[PDB]
Amino acid sequence: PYVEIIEQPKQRGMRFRYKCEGRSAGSIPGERSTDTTKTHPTIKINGYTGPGTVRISLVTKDPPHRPHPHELVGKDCRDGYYEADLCPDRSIHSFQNLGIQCVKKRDLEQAISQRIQTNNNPFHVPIEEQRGDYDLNAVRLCFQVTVRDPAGRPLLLTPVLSHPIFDNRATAELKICRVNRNSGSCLGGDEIFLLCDKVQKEDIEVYFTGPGWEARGSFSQADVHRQVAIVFRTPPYADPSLQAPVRVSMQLRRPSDRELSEPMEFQYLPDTDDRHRIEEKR
Amino acid sequence: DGDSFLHLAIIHEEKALTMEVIRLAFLNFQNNLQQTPLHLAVITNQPEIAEALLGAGCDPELRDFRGNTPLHLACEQGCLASVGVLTQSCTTPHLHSILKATNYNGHTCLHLASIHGYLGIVELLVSLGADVNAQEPCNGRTALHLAVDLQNPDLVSLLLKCGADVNRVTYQGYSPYQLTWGRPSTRIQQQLGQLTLENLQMLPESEDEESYDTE
Amino acid sequence: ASNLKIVRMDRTAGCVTGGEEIYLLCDKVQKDDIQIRFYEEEENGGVWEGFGDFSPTDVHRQFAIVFKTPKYKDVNITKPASVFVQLRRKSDLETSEPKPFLYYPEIKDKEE
């Protein structure tokens, strides 16, 4: 009897745009989206399946989750949020279309007017719990799912918040300062501590490029220590039966703009003598 | 290689040759790699030679240049036979004993077997008394943190039925689930989300120029 | 603000000879007000004290330290010895929680 986001939206990367220009053209990508593979904000209902509705509104990033002056745009959207029927045949609901339309502070006093007008306040906070500090830098999608009571009452499920999604910053200079290791097995799996300048954990990776080769270092968003260090494991090299060491490039890469830091040489090697605690040629 | 009257015999698959039966204190030292004959038994993958523990081979450190005990070697190589033989050796029931022993990386036999996804070795170990929730010193990760990092779903469901505490954190205060963010496996963030404490699920959000988990 | 905790260490073992580099992640530290103290309780009650060789410039952006292990009190022991390592502010002498570190011998160190 609950809604769980299975595919959080991509946090960094998307630029909140204004109505004057136009509606949009592109929608909020899913967290697992790559520059080639597409995904979208996806949810899943538990303990239930059948008719019903889903409402998706914007809300602040900070605890007192107040409605947000920005207004989701696109299909099934109106007044500022999204609202459509729930396909009864499946329990997983993805949104292939959703756009964050930003409001201009000069008219933010109007946007909020409408918010309470259409009483679009998922967590319904009082008018005194709606201060004037609106972090227009971010926003969080709110999932108001409605269904049927085991009897007849339209059961309104608990509103689930997505990870805040941010706007366009750009521009920072990816710089690798130190690396405790610039050599490892061709079978990959080597842990490496890398010290860098400030980086964002939802928008960073370690790009290992070679001649006609390319892989990424394995690590979690949590392995990004305070924006200035990254602990990850090296990917397997193209040739896993390497007989002679091979130099490869290793760099910081910001996905949202394809930006790359200066390359640092990295030398793959075979497991030869270590793969069996030395034996051959006694 | 300060070989003994057995390494050569050992490396070279031999009968009584590679198994001189005697039956200054009869013993077997180790090479420049700190490998005792028994380590070679495992590395070489010849249980029988190991089967013949005979004089209680190195009962204290019995380690290598990386800090592994023979059983450690058996667990990262994945030889079920050796884990089987090297387990009857009546010493592990002692204190500090192998099932709790760690190499110079603070890795347990359980850790090494989890790292290489040997689901069967992990099962036998926990069965024999290994702490499924034992932590490794670098970051305090349990084998469940490693299964998530290794993105092994088969491994994580197996640590779950072995008693792995879905909660329990790292020196950075992260539950295994908090390590799923930014990774691929939806299957992993599904079999853990449910189990994990409500406030051990999300990641810190740029707090006071630092953002610690707190623990 | 500047609590003292060792978050992650790329290595938790080392040779008694010392000199081995090590990356250490931690909570906010000031580069000129911090040290890495290695130590072990002794038979007589005193403690062997050893420090990590590093300069303020090694303290990376307030949350990391690239340092070099000190030499162990006895570089010729035959079996590894467990000691403790910890951070310490110079200004008030507070330390992070005592963390286990293993010094092992060097069967391959000098002469041939």
Domain of A118, CATH number, reads 2.60.40.340
Interface check A148 vs B, CB under 8 A: no
Q: What is the four-CA torsion angle of A49, A55, A56, A58, rounded to 10 degrees?
A: -150
Instruction: Give the C-alpha separation, A10 to B167, whole Å.
Output: 26
Under 8 Å between Cβ of B58 and B89: no
Helix (H), strand (E), coil (C) string for chain B: CCCCCCHHHHHCCCCCCCCCCCCCCCCCCCCCCCCCHHHHHHHCCCHHHHHCCCCCCCCCCCCCCCCCCHHHHHHHHCCHHHHHHHHHCCCCCCCCCHHHCCCCCCCCHHHHHHHCCCHHHHHHHHHHCCCCCCCCCCCCCCHHHHHHHCCCHHHHHHHHCCCCCCCCCCCCCCCHHHHCCCCCCHHHHHHHHCCCCHHHCCCCCCCCCCCCCCC
Where does a domain end: A168, A194, A223? A168
Under 8 Å between Cβ of C47 and C41: yes
Where does a domain end: A133, A168, A203? A168
Residue for token pair 């300062």: A177
Give the nearest partner residue to B180 out of A4, A201, A220, using CB atoms. Answer: A220
Under 8 Å between Cβ of B140 and B169: yes
Residue A233 and residue A128 in one domain: no
Cβ neighbours, 10 Å, residue A84:
14
Residue for token pair 């406030």: B199
Contact residues for B21 (Cβ-Cβ < 8 A; gap 6+):
none
Residue A187 and residue A92 in one domain: no
Under 8 Å between Cβ of C65 and C26: yes
Q: Return the structure tokens found at A158.
A: 């608990």
Distances from the Cα of B118 to the Cα of A194, B79, B124, B147, angstroms: 30, 9, 10, 11
What residues does A265 pair with on adjacent strands? A249
Instruction: Give the C-alpha separation, A69 to B36, whole Å.
Output: 71
What number of H helices and E strands is found in chain A? 1, 22
Residue A182 counted as domain residue: yes
Beta strands A160-161 and A138-148 are antiparallel
Which helix (H) or strand (E) covers residue A109, if one does? helix A108-117
Residue A9 counted as domain residue: yes
From the candidates B136, B171, B213, which should be mutated to test the interface with C, based on the most C CB atoms within 10 A? B171
Q: Which chains, if any, share at least 3 CB pairs under 8 A with chain A?
A: B, C
B102-B104-B109 Cα angle (round to 5): 30
Residue A185 and residue A81 in one domain: no
**Is the CB of A6 less than 8 angstroms away from the CB of B181?**
no
**Residue C78 burial by CB count (10 A; 0-12/13-18/19+): exposed, middle or buried?**
exposed
Q: How far is B9 from chain C (nearest CA, A)?
A: 23
Residue A133 and residue A2 in one domain: yes
Axis-axis angle for helices B70-77, B80-88 (nearest 10):
160
Residue A44 counted as domain residue: yes
**Is the CB of C23 less than 8 angstroms away from the CB of A198?**
no
**Is the CB of C12 less than 8 angstroms away from the CB of B212?**
no
Instruction: Give the C-alpha separation, A190 to A181, whole Å.
Output: 9
Cα Rg of chain B (Å, integer): 20
**Is the CB of A221 less than 8 angstroms away from the CB of B43?**
no
Total domain count, chain A: 2
A172-A178-A184 Cα angle (round to 5): 120
Residue A173 and residue A253 in one domain: yes
What residues does A84 pair with on adjacent strands? A54
Total domain count, chain B: 1
At what resolution in Å was this solved? Answer: 2.3
Residue A162 and residue A187 in one domain: no
Domain residue limits at B199: 1-215
Residue A36 and residue A110 in one domain: yes
Which helix (H) or strand (E) covers residue A184, if one does? strand A183-185
Residue A279 counted as domain residue: no
Under 8 Å between Cβ of A252 and A176: yes
Residue for token pair 């033989």: B85
**Could you tell me which chain B residue has the CA closest to the CA of C82?**
B104
**Could you tell me which chain B residue has the CA closest to the CA of C26?**
B172
Which residues does a gap of C–N over 2.5 Å follow in chain B?
23
Domain residue limits at A108: 1-168
Instruction: Give the C-alpha separation, A253 to A273, whole Å.
Output: 33
Q: Is A106 helix (H, G, I), strand (E, B) or coil?
A: helix
Instruction: Give the C-alpha separation, C69 to C13, whole Å.
Output: 10
Under 8 Å between Cβ of A68 and A139: yes
Q: Return the structure tokens found at B16.
A: 């009584």
Under 8 Å between Cβ of A82 and A162: no
In this complex, how many residue pairs, one in chain A and one in chain C, have their CB atoms less than 8 Å apart? 42
Which helix (H) or strand (E) covers residue C84, if one does? strand C81-89
Contact residues for A75 (Cβ-Cβ < 8 A; gap 6+):
A82, A84, A97
Residue for token pair 């090694």: C58
Instruction: Enumerate domains of chain C plus CATH numbers.
Output: 1-112 (2.60.40.10)
Which helix (H) or strand (E) covers residue A116, if one does? helix A108-117
Residue A74 and residue A146 in one domain: yes
Residue A182 and residue A149 in one domain: no
Q: Return the structure tokens found at B60.
A: 């204290």
Across A150-162, b (16+ Cβ under 10 Å) vs e yields eeeeeeebebbbb
Q: Return the structure tokens found at B147.
A: 């299964």
Which residues does a gap of C–N over 2.5 Å follow in chain A?
170
Q: How far is A221 from chain B (nearest CA, A)?
A: 5
Q: What is the four-CA torsion angle of A123, A129, A131, A134, rounded to 10 degrees?
A: -20
Residue A139 counted as domain residue: yes
Distances from the Cα of C108 to the Cα of A62, A114, B65, C16, C78, angstroms: 58, 77, 10, 12, 12
Instruction: Give the C-alpha separation, B40 to B22, whole Å.
Output: 20
Cβ neighbours, 10 Å, residue A149:
9
Residue A275 counted as domain residue: no
Under 8 Å between Cβ of A270 and A242: yes
Under 8 Å between Cβ of C22 and C68: yes
Nearest by Cα to C81 from C41, C24, C37, C35:
C41
**Where residue B188 sits, what CATH number does that domain have?**
1.25.40.20
Cβ neighbours, 10 Å, residue A13:
20
Residue A100 and residue A138 in one domain: yes
Nearest by Cα to B18 from B33, B32, B37, B34:
B37
Under 8 Å between Cβ of A228 and C64: yes
Residue A162 and residue A191 in one domain: no
Residue A217 and residue A100 in one domain: no
Instruction: Give the C-alpha separation, B12 to A216, whole Å.
Output: 41
**Could you tell me which chain B residue has the CA closest to the CA of A8?**
B181
Contact residues for B55 (Cβ-Cβ < 8 A; gap 6+):
B22, B26, B27, B28
Where does a domain end: A168, A199, A217? A168
